[PDB]
């Protein structure tokens, strides 16, 4: 309709007034007090903060410079925070401050107590069809929002959903997004959610997202992704093989749904055919989903996390608590001149 058609013509002139002109240096990190470790690993860490001004609550992104530089991430970092700053939407997590220093950049989020939805998947077990469908419909309106923009997302995995104080998504971790025009080439991602032609080595465009939400629907449902095995090469062996199995309590509706997301060709998987994202909204395992409610956050949500209040991190787990440490001297200062 052109409602939906007007939505999203303003939503792309926004993005891209922010895209052209970013948002740089809007704090520094003696304005907070740490409060605990998130998270860590391969995307650098993340740390529950406390805005000493104001008393607000926060997930800070910490990239050490030095070691992005190793890893061979300097694109993917400047990507990230480009597409941040200038993206907007009720199902994305917001940022709202960055900044660097003489050893690491720093992306502030909003903090979303409830956790990870993988948490609450493996403590439950596996989602009712209602359930993952709820989830699902908001994965659908971001990609459609995203895909109109030219940003591919890259990296859809129950961690990277977390569950927010009325039990909606806000989707966390822009580290693999990009904008594209075309078709573009990078090994990257998680390896139970690839789609065959990045295992394949192709130019790959945004059917890779569609793949992926196939994927996670999959995940939600079952109690485990469809494709699994033990080691990565086992696992791109059975996705590139174009045949999974399908547990009886499926319904007949999200069996269909599933074969035509999770469709080797990319020439013939839906969100990649001449309706776009309309044959999946008007798929029948989508029949009762009220498109306009779920954007509106008007449905009621299938469960609220337990939590005490907007510093409680009771629905996190514990890490080893490492400093922040800033050196005298200035890394890497050429490399990320424009963050
Ligand atoms: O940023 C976060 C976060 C971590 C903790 C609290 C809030 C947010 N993530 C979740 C875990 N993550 C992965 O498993 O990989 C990507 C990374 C993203
Ligand atoms: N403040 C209150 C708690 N929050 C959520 O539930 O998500 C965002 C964050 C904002």
């Not at 860490?45 to 910490?62: D, F, P, Q, S």
């Amino acid at each position: 309709q052109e409602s939906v058609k007007e939505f999203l013509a303003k939503a792309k002139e926004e993005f891209l007034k922010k895209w052209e002109s970013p948002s740089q240096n809007t704090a520094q990190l003696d304005h907070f007090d740490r409060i605990k470790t998130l998270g860590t690993g391969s995307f650098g860490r993340v740390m529950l903060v406390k805005h000493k001004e104001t008393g607000n609550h926060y997930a800070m992104k910490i990239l050490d410079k030095q070691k992005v530089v190793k890893l061979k991430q300097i694109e993917h970092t400047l990507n990230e925070k480009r597409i941040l700053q200038a993206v907007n939407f009720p199902f994305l997590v917001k940022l709202e401050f960055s900044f660097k220093d003489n050893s690491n950049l720093y992306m502030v989020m909003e903090y979303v107590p409830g956790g990870e939805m993988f948490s609450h998947l493996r403590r439950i077990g596996r989602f009712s069809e209602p359930h993952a469908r709820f989830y699902a419909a908001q994965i659908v309106l971001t990609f459609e929002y995203l895909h109109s923009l030219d940003l591919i997302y890259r990296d859809l995995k129950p961690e990277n959903l977390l569950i927010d104080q009325q039990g909606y998504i806000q989707v966390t971790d822009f580290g693999f997004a990009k904008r594209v025009k075309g078709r573009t080439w990078t090994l990257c991602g998680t390896p139970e959610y690839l789609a065959p032609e990045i295992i394949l080595s192709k130019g790959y465009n945004k059917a890779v997202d569609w793949w992926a939400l196939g994927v996670l629907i999959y995940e939600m449902a079952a109690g485990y992704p469809p494709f699994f095995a033990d080691q990565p090469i086992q696992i791109y062996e059975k996705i590139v093989s174009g045949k999974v199995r399908f547990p009886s309590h499926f319904s007949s509706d999200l069996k269909d749904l599933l074969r035509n997301l999770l469709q080797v060709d990319l020439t013939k998987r839906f969100g990649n055919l001449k309706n776009g994202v309309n044959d999946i909204k008007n798929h029948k395992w989508f029949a009762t989903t009220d498109w306009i409610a779920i954007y509106q956050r008007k449905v009621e949500a299938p469960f609220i996390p337990k939590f005490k209040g907007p510093g409680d991190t009771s629905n996190f787990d514990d890490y080893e608590e490492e400093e922040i440490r800033v050196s005298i001297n200035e890394k890497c200062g050429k490399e990320f001149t424009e963050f």
